[PDB]
Symmetry: C3
Subunit: 222 residues, 3 copies
């Protein structure tokens, strides 16, 4: 019910008139949603599927990456320089630098210029290998190469492969949706996601988003 003509659509029963002809159920995540007609061209639709999933993979890492140090500081008694994700980058400018987990023996980076231009070379080469191949194999598929990147062979079965593609893109869209939550939540409340959540569950009727509705993405206008 996630592929083919009898798949799930993005409006449930009210989908009978809101699914374009080119969204036929072939690709993962096809809920028949393209109201803006941005993927009518088959080549562009291929590009947007590549844009979407690559984003979804970064968001999946992002939600765990943003929540982990804040959850470790608030519930694991760990002492980071800055454990909140939107302030975490700034701990490179403090005295002592960026000590991993607060431990000065771990990483302990002192120069943002080294962090920056090391990432440029590594990610520059790594992304170059993604489009045209490199040390860890040939780029047989822009999203699912599954050579060195499927060591446990979880994509070997063609039938479960089709279902795993669905699980990947649905969890990824949830992660992207959450990362967008982090962004506006941080501008609006000024606090980290863990702290936002904790404050909310304590008094959900009083600790929700509408408390900050008088600000425009942080800015207190009017």
């Amino acid at each position: 019910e996630f592929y083919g003509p009898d798949r799930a659509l993005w409006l449930g029963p009210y989908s009978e008139g809101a699914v374009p002809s080119y969204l036929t159920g072939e690709f993962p995540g096809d809920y028949g949603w393209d109201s803006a007609g941005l993927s009518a061209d088959p080549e562009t639709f291929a590009a947007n599927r590549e844009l979407e999933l690559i984003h979804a993979r970064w968001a999946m890492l992002g939600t765990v990456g943003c929540l982990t140090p804040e959850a470790l500081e608030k519930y694991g008694g760990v002492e980071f320089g800055e454990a909140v994700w939107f302030k975490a980058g700034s701990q490179i400018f403090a005295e002592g630098g960026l000590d991993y987990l607060g431990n000065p023996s771990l990483v302990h980076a002192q120069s943002i210029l080294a962090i920056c231009w090391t990432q440029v070379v590594l990610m520059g080469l790594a992304e170059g290998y993604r489009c045209s191949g490199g040390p860890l194999g040939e780029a047989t598929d822009p999203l699912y190469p599954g050579e060195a990147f499927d060591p446990m062979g979880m994509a070997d079965d063609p039938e479960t492969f089709a279902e795993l593609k669905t699980k990947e893109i649905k969890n990824g869209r949830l992660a992207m949706f959450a990362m967008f939550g982090f962004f506006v939540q941080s501008l609006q409340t000024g606090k980290g996601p863990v702290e936002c959540w904790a404050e909310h569950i304590a008094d959900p009727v009083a600790n929700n988003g509408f408390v900050y509705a008088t600000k425009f993405f942080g800015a207190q206008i009017f």
Copy 2:
């Protein structure tokens, strides 16, 4: 006719001849031959953008009247709202007394934004669902012009005047969208309501115009 077909009005007047794409043929309402960014070269995308544009235009038409009415009512009709300016109207739900319609505490008198929010989700969620796939008030025969229960006075029964009404609708809407964009930037830049801006301007148009606030970037006084 001068709003359809090959001799219709174009978006550059006489300087148009060389700035009209081949796929803008004069078929749909509002076709002034303007798609310089080639965003509607695909016929299917063009179909979506016409639906986006008109659906926007209908919200803008309601918006301009919706934004101006309580402010015009307060400034010239002596009505006492909690917040009569559109961009401050939402905040009245957090004020004491809540959202009193027309200022009357016996009208609406809403106290909970959470109730306003999740009521609109259900009502608009179904209403938009009925728009794409039909529902209680008929079948969604056309994404923009169903005209069943939504043409009760049958003004679209004549094919010729129907074509002229479609033109009037999309032109008034683009004017409304263009005006709502005015509301947005005027509020960020001046901080006042549209009615007050209009009144202040005609008082001294040479001194009360936009360039007084050009040193601010959409409200922010940078540099």
Copy 3:
């Protein structure tokens, strides 16, 4: 030899083939095979985007020289402008005496912002009309390369050097657009002019670089 056709230079160097869309074949200037978002898969849109890009590149090329000239002239040529920094240059029309060209009160000496604005509307309005459909300086034979009155020195008469000049034009223009993007973000972040940023940087590059302002979001010091 290496900027057109199948053996041209691409936007990822050796890692490029397999990251070049089928519709980027080497025919047009600047074709490094970069359209990862597939925004130009449609031939007609791709035609529009090439016009958007090049017209921007020409405005950016004029922009970089226009933004750097008064700031470099004021700080290194002993010239006294009213406001020599580009993002402050527009505001000098609101000061007393107005916009004196090069600071000399006998040059221009504009006093009305409304006069500058609505003269530009008429002049640029007609000029852009002449660009799409032709006019006094000839017919619009080509949307980007008319080369009638706009190639008086006939530098594009040789077909081979024309092909190379087209390449140089788009590469210098993309650098200018990329640089203008630098001006925009640099001014929001640092609050200083491009020349002064350059001068401050070369004095102590390890301490006078962008990361000093990384805690601000395009000017705003949030968090």
